[PDB]
Amino acid sequence: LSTWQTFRRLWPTIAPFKAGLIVAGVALILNAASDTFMLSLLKPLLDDGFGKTDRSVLVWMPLVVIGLMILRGITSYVSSYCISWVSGKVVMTMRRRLFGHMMGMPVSFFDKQSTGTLLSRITYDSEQVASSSSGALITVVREGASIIGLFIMMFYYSWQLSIILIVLAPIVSIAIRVVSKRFRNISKNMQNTMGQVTTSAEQMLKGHKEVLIFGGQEVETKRFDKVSNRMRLQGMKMVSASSISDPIIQLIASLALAFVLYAASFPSVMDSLTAGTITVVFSSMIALMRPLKSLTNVNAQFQRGMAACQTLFTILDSEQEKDEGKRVIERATGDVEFRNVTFTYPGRDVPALRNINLKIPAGKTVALVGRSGSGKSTIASLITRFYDIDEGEILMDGHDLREYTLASLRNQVALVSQNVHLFNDTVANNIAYARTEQYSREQIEEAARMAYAMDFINKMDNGLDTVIGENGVLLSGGQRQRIAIARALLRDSPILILDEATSALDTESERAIQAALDELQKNRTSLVIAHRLSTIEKADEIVVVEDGVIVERGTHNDLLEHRGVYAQLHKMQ
Amino acid sequence: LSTWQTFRRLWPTIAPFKAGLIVAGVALILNAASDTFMLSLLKPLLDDGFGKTDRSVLVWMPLVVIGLMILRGITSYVSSYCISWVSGKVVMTMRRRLFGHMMGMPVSFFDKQSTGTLLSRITYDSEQVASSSSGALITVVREGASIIGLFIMMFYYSWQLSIILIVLAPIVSIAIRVVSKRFRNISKNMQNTMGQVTTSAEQMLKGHKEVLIFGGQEVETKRFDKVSNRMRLQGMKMVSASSISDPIIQLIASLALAFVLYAASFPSVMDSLTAGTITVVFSSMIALMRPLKSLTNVNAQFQRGMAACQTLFTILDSEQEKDEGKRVIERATGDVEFRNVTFTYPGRDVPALRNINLKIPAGKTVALVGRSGSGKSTIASLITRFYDIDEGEILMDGHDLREYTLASLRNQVALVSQNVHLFNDTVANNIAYARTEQYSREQIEEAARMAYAMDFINKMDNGLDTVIGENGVLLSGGQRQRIAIARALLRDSPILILDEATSALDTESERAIQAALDELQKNRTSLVIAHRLSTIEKADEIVVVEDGVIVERGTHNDLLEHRGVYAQLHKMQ
Ligand SMILES: CCCCCCCCCCCCCC(=O)O[C@H](CCCCCCCCCCC)CC(=O)O[C@@H]1[C@@H](NC(=O)C[C@@H](CCCCCCCCCCC)OC(=O)CCCCCCCCCCC)[C@H](OC[C@H]2O[C@H](OP(=O)(O)O)[C@H](NC(=O)C[C@H](O)CCCCCCCCCCC)[C@@H](OC(=O)C[C@H](O)CCCCCCCCCCC)[C@@H]2O)O[C@H](CO[C@]2(C(=O)O)C[C@@H](O[C@]3(C(=O)O)C[C@@H](O)[C@@H](O)[C@@H]([C@H](O)CO)O3)[C@@H](O)[C@@H]([C@H](O)CO)O2)[C@H]1OP(=O)(O)O
Ligand SMILES: CCCCCCCCCCCCCC(=O)O[C@H](CCCCCCCCCCC)CC(=O)O[C@@H]1[C@@H](NC(=O)C[C@@H](CCCCCCCCCCC)OC(=O)CCCCCCCCCCC)[C@H](OC[C@H]2O[C@H](OP(=O)(O)O)[C@H](NC(=O)C[C@H](O)CCCCCCCCCCC)[C@@H](OC(=O)C[C@H](O)CCCCCCCCCCC)[C@@H]2O)O[C@H](CO[C@]2(C(=O)O)C[C@@H](O[C@]3(C(=O)O)C[C@@H](O)[C@@H](O)[C@@H]([C@H](O)CO)O3)[C@@H](O)[C@@H]([C@H](O)CO)O2)[C@H]1OP(=O)(O)O
Ligand SMILES: CCCCCCCCCCOCCOCCOCCOCCOCCO
Ligand SMILES: CCCCCCCCCCOCCOCCOCCOCCOCCO
Ligand SMILES: CCCCCCCCCCOCCOCCOCCOCCOCCO
Ligand SMILES: CCCCCCCCCCOCCOCCOCCOCCOCCO
């Protein structure tokens, strides 16, 4: 994309805020008129001096000065506020769009991505668009208008002396194009290195205990020194590009003044031009040099937001998770059936699942038994369509999972596990997450009571109104699991995927969690990734998965009689 | 801290780079001299006009113009590069200092802190110091020098007319102080809101699967909309503060011109002052208006980096982990002994451990068995002094853990667990992490072979030179655990803390891990947080912990005969 093609994509997110641009332009025009009036009123005083001015006017001069200063202040405030308003609105819109697009990405997208990269895209890359939104555009318009008006003036006074403008405009245009490409390249490099800095800090924070145990504060110091210096040198590249471009443009511009002075040294080429137009033309190019410098100065900021806009639009054109299904399931009252389901993780060679033929009958419990890495977690992820299967089909209520909408499909499945993510909000808002307007406080309290969680909630500062989250008031593993059980009871999801806890907690918490899960939770179509023999023995059907295939299936007594894999696994339990 | 007190703290990190400031100042002086010479050479041409100048001079005029433009370009490049160089060096120094300080903080510091806050401090707050490092200082010096020189000229020409300056300077000073405080407050608010934005995006990327399962893309959209708009409105507060401050300062300054014009309206006050000094004084105040505006404009940036500096220095004055011990242990050849150790986690009311009397003999293995949350993980954390015990003492080779240096103490302990943090580096560099210069490639390969890890390492692209990490080429749970076993074998740490895996892997990986851990690892002073009965039966001593107290201790057969906690614990196994 060229600097015009990417700007036309950025215009639709500035159009809702073009009223600020219009008001800023009107205020700037008023300010220019006031300054012109001030200069007209002030030139006699500065040039001729005091004494040649009428005394009566001098009495009213201070009030005029104060009023003109007040008008200038009002217009300046209006212009600055409107420009910054448009810039901030555009930056906020870009941030929200990036956040929503990241929210719509597939689960596989986040495995190949680093968190620091996305964080820098939201926090750093979006801010760089601010320049090319309001301030740079207005500056470009003003300086271009000044340059065009000066060109028309120069060709009106002397067209022959102005052929140097036709000679030199392509040169400055070429230089501006070259340095604009350079600016965009440097800006993209800076964005990448900012993401790298964020990632390096994140990796130090995530492995801080490993840095303490093994030492290596020195090696991490050097590793971060490299990235910090890389960001420093990228900024230096930007500065050097700007500081080399501006003087070169100014020198090419002054080539015109040099040509005019050389032409004015010829008596033959001096009397024809009356020696009065030459002075006007020379002053015109002198006045032309300044807006050119302003334009080249604003070009660097404009190309830093054009490079950010290009990256942001490339991100916003990415492929989100496929939602081509149109059916809307209300309640899954049927059986979840796997029909020859073969799945391979993206980027991996060996399939995680091979020819899986698994049925979960309605209202029954199926226990997935197997070692770590066998594929039970893959089955759980495929049921909720976090990944799409390569071959086969998974049927919910007799229809394939890819035919239902993602929202309606995921409204049917409840995921209960020891590891619970707590959203930064109140406890009741966590129990009724995404459905606060649907469930009342009485229903929330009933669900929390049924999940055996009211005791610890009532032992807090505000009970159900205590603001909890991952950052702040947190809960132990049992308490968050009971909160998840309360959420699943309130939602009343027909299908339950239970990822069992590998380690038992204290007797009270264990008893409460077991009572909740047994009496209240497990009365629906349940698939449990089980870990303790007790829950295996209480399951309606047991499926043994080894190396991505099902090697055994049946009940506890049946599989004990078969003396298969489950026999040995129950033995070592 | 006042704006002068926080600047004197920032000066020592600019002093290493004052050569850039000096060179920038010299280049600016040369540029001013060149501009003065150019103006002296240019005024006759613009005012008198062409035709009144010597033709011989006009012959050499274009070359003079080209040379002056080249000189201006060179000086401008030098000044800009030096200013930006100093600013970038200071920003990089601040980033490195923040990174090292965060790296030196205690483990308890990171439980009360959000990752996004620290990330924003490194990435955003450090950058805001750039303005107040080189560019703002030079601008302040230049404009202050201009203002002071204009004041001296004004009192030289007419001291009586200049009393208005003495009257109006306190007013502008008071206004500047007020708006400087406002700028610093707004900047601190903006830093806080940037941290809030980074945490909100980071929390959505951590609960993305919970957002998909429960819906709530709408609620997360609104939650991020609030923070985005908060950052928008903070930036707009900054803009409004600047745009209200500057016109008010300009109006107070123009009050002096109003006073001069009012005084000039009296023939008594005009004939006495010769009516020629009044014009000079008026022109002087008009010329003085501009540097005041430049100073007020640069004040906003200066106060955004003064606020950033204040926050950064408050962070850098924080308390790191205590290292008051002076003994240096070379190799722990004795017993780790707990003597009445009572520990409470920071912020928690109930103690995590109570009256722990635990001895780990040299070259022996002790198995810690208990429910999750009992305190075994707390014991493991206390051995490595991630936390300091409230009461009692822990003896390493007969001396308390608080008497040794942290580095020497942690050189004695090796932590092996299923969850392994992979530093972004080659496999051999991970095995020899922090000790690459000490161990050769032959030793690394021998350790990897002994850890039964040479197979899958040879099954990679570059073997031991393949760059792995948390972001990029990752490894399964068994592979990183075997890499950690290889690291611990290479380091040959006398004391081993083994946090056992709660779930078995496939047959090959499980067999390799068990062989490595048994034959090679477990031949030293080992403390195992065990999970499988087989490990318990192979341990030299067993300790059972409930509710942070040891309830039963002995051997496998002894504890079976005791019919205590371990009897039941083995029973449901
Ligand atoms: C073409 C013709 C026109 C056509 C029609 C228009 C066309 C379209 C226009 C396009 C552009 C659209 C722009 C827009 O549409 O803009 C709108 C404005 C609406 C009007 C637009 C149409 C206009 C129609 C025509 C009107 C006119 C007829 C709203 C907005 O944008 O801004 C709104 C802001 N409004 C202003 O800023 C007024 C502000 C902006 C208005 C913009 C005007 C320019 C553009 C308009 C175009 C103009 C056309 C002509 O005008 C001013 O000032 C005027 C000052 C004059 C300056 C003169 C200059 C010098 C004079 C000459 C000198 C010689 C508003 O600020 C609030 C206060 O901020 C500071 O106090 P604080 O301390 O911070 O509290 C200021 N304190 C200051 O000191 C300012 C500064 O320090 C000055 C320092 C200077 C120091 C000088 C020292 C001097 C010393 C003396 C010397 C010794 C104070 O100012 C004031 O006091 C003003 C003060 O009296 C003025 C004083 C008098 C004048 C002084 C000079 C006199 C001198 C002369 C002497 C001769 C100001 O009141 O905040 C909300 C958002 O916040 C909220 C909300 O409450 O609404 C709350 C927020 O809640 C939370 C949160 O969640 O975060 C949680 C809460 O618990 C809480 O924590 C809060 C928050 O943090 C708490 O602090 O936050 C959240 O709910 C949020 C929503 O999320 C949003 O969605 O909403 C913004 O809304 P938003 O946009 O929805 O976000
Ligand atoms: C008082 C008197 C003095 C007393 C003594 C001094 C006192 C103390 C001074 C205080 C201040 C200290 C400052 C300092 O101390 O400064 C030092 C400088 C050392 C000198 C200081 C003392 C000086 C003594 C006296 C000398 C003089 C006698 C080093 C530094 O700071 O900068 C060093 C940089 N040097 C410069 O930039 C020269 C640069 C800077 C020098 C600074 C001077 C100013 C300050 C000095 C004070 C001056 C005193 C008087 O001077 C210039 O230019 C001059 C240009 C002239 C401009 C004239 C203006 C106009 C004229 C008038 C016109 C009318 C260096 O750049 C490299 C190249 O960058 C771009 O190419 P790239 O494409 O990006 O590769 C530029 N390409 C450009 O196009 C520039 C730009 O586009 C221009 C676009 C413009 C477009 C215009 C279009 C026009 C169209 C035409 C019209 C149609 C190219 O420039 C050049 O081509 C230059 C070019 O020929 C010039 C051309 C001729 C002139 C043109 C004009 C002619 C026109 C006139 C016509 C009449 C430049 O060569 O990079 C290293 C770091 O990188 C490395 C390293 O290799 O060293 C590698 C890095 O590795 C990695 C990584 O890990 O990241 C991994 C790698 O695999 C790889 O990936 C790399 C990297 O990414 C790969 O790309 O990165 C890592 O290892 C890192 C360490 O980590 C650091 O620790 O080190 C920096 O070192 P660092 O500081 O250690 O970091
Ligand atoms: C002496 C001072 C005078 C000040 C004058 C100020 C003028 C204010 C003008 C405001 O600037 C707005 C300029 O932006 C206009 C950009 O238009 C782009 C339109 O292109 C749309 C192309 O299609 C986009 C569809 O995606
Ligand atoms: C001393 C003269 C100063 C003139 C200043 C003029 C500044 C203009 C800079 C604009 O640069 C924009 C670069 O974009 C390229 C413009 O697009 C060119 C389209 O192609 C035109 C084809 O015409 C060729 C005729 O030679
Ligand atoms: C017409 C243009 C002329 C340009 C002149 C440019 C002058 C260059 C001056 C460079 O600026 C440096 C100013 O900074 C000096 C700050 O000094 C602070 C010293 O205070 C130290 C106090 O103790 C600190 C100990 O912690
Ligand atoms: C129309 C006149 C324009 C003059 C411009 C002057 C600008 C100076 C602004 C500097 O502001 C800095 C604010 O810091 C306060 C300075 O410290 C004051 C120390 O106390 C001095 C005590 O003297 C009191 C005499 O009244």
Residue numbers in the entry:
A (entry chain A), B (entry chain B): 7 to 579
Reproduce text from the manuscript describing this model.
The ATP-binding cassette (ABC) transporter, MsbA, plays a pivotal role in lipopolysaccharide (LPS) biogenesis by facilitating the transport of the LPS precursor lipooligosaccharide (LOS) from the cytoplasmic to the periplasmic leaflet of the inner membrane. MsbA forms a homodimer and exhibits a topology similar to other ABC transporters, comprising two NBDs and two transmembrane domains (TMDs) containing 12 transmembrane helices. An ATP hydrolysis-driven conformational change promotes the transition to an outward-facing (OF) conformation, facilitating the flipping of LOS to the periplasmic side of the inner membrane for further modifications.
First, well-resolved density is observed for KDL binding, even for the six lipid tails. The positioning of KDL is centered on TM5, occupying a specific region within the cytoplasmic leaflet of the inner membrane. This location has recently been identified as the exterior LOS binding site of MsbA, a site that is important for stimulation of MsbA ATPase by hexaacylated lipid A species. The coordination of KDL is reminiscent of our recent structure with R188 and R238 interacting with the characteristic phosphoglucosamine (P-GlcN) moieties of LOS. However, an additional contact is formed between N235 and one of the Kdo molecules of the headgroup. While the structure is in an open, outward conformation, the transporter is not bound to nucleotide. The π–π interaction of Y351 of the A-loop with the adenosine moiety (observed in nucleotide bound structures) is substituted by a cation–π interaction with R354, priming the NBDs for binding ATP.
